[PDB]
Amino acid sequence: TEFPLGCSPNVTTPKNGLSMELYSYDYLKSGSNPCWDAAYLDPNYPRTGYKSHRLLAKVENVAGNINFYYHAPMGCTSLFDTLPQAYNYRTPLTMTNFTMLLYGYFKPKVTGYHTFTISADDLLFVNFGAGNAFDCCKRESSADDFGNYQAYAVWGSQTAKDDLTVHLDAGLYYPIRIFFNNRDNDGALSLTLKTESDPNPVIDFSDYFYSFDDTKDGCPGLVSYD
Numbered sequence: 001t002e003f004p005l006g007c008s009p010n011v012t013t014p015k016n017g018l019s020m021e022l023y024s025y026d027y028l029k030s031g032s033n034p035c036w037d038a039a040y041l042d043p044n045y046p047r048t049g050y051k052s053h054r055l056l057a058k059v060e061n062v063a064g065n066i067n068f069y070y071h072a073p074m075g076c077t078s079l080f081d082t083l084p085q086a087y088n089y090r091t092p093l094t095m096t097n098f099t100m101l102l103y104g105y106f107k108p109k110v111t112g113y114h115t116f117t118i119s120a121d122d123l124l125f126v127n128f129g130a131g132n133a134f135d136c137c138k139r140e141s142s143a144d145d146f147g148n149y150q151a152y153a154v155w156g157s158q159t160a161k162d163d164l165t166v167h168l169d170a171g172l173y174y175p176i177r178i179f180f181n182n183r184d185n186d187g188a189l190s191l192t193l194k195t196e197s198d199p200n201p202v203i204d205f206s207d208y209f210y211s212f213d214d215t216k217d218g219c220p221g222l223v224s225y226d
């Protein structure tokens, strides 16, 4: 979808950052082969399966550079460490093995083609646009109804759709859903943005990520090109 749908909330002062939910991703019982839980590859794990795991936290105002590489001291071992400051989550968690969901809206600074590139260890699935991620100012009621991933990356796969190239309007806020899993060992998440008019890739999304309350009527985008 080259021209994803955006949204036009009625809001004077939009809330900065995305929402985040963290969930457990336990290893299998010691002695299993392989050591890691394979659930993360199930088509419905990112839709409702993660809800069968333990909720670790719901966090707000996630903004900044969300990229990280975590080097596990050893494999098949649950080890504790911390996320980058952008995640607004300061306490140690099992960086070797966890599930993370981010959602909210992306606001472009300049109208035009935007290329988002992703890489992950182990898994990063991205939905982008109204409908595809969720409905405009109707997130809660459409939360589990996201469509085909606009980008996806899975460690060890002949993966692909490591990028998404879309025409965006600076006047709209675009629903975005980012689903991450580390099954074991090293963990890594990279999201970057390249615009056609700007020479430097963007890695700090401080000014681009927003959250909005849902409304009875919704807030469909008021920019259209056909």
Ligand SMILES: OC[C@H]1O[C@@H](O[C@H]2[C@H](O)[C@@H](O)[C@H](O)O[C@@H]2CO)[C@H](O)[C@@H](O)[C@H]1O
Pocket (backbone or CB within 6 Å): 034, 035, 036, 075, 076, 121, 122, 155, 183, 184, 185, 186, 187
């Ligand atoms: O290499 C990244 C990759 O590691 C897997 O773990 C491997 C590890 O690479 C290897 O040194 C060890 O001997 O076996 C491990 C298999 O349990 C992770 O499973 C994978 O998620 C990546 O992080």
Ligand SMILES: [Ca+2]
Pocket (backbone or CB within 6 Å): 121, 122, 182, 183, 184, 185, 186, 187
């Ligand atoms: Ca891993």
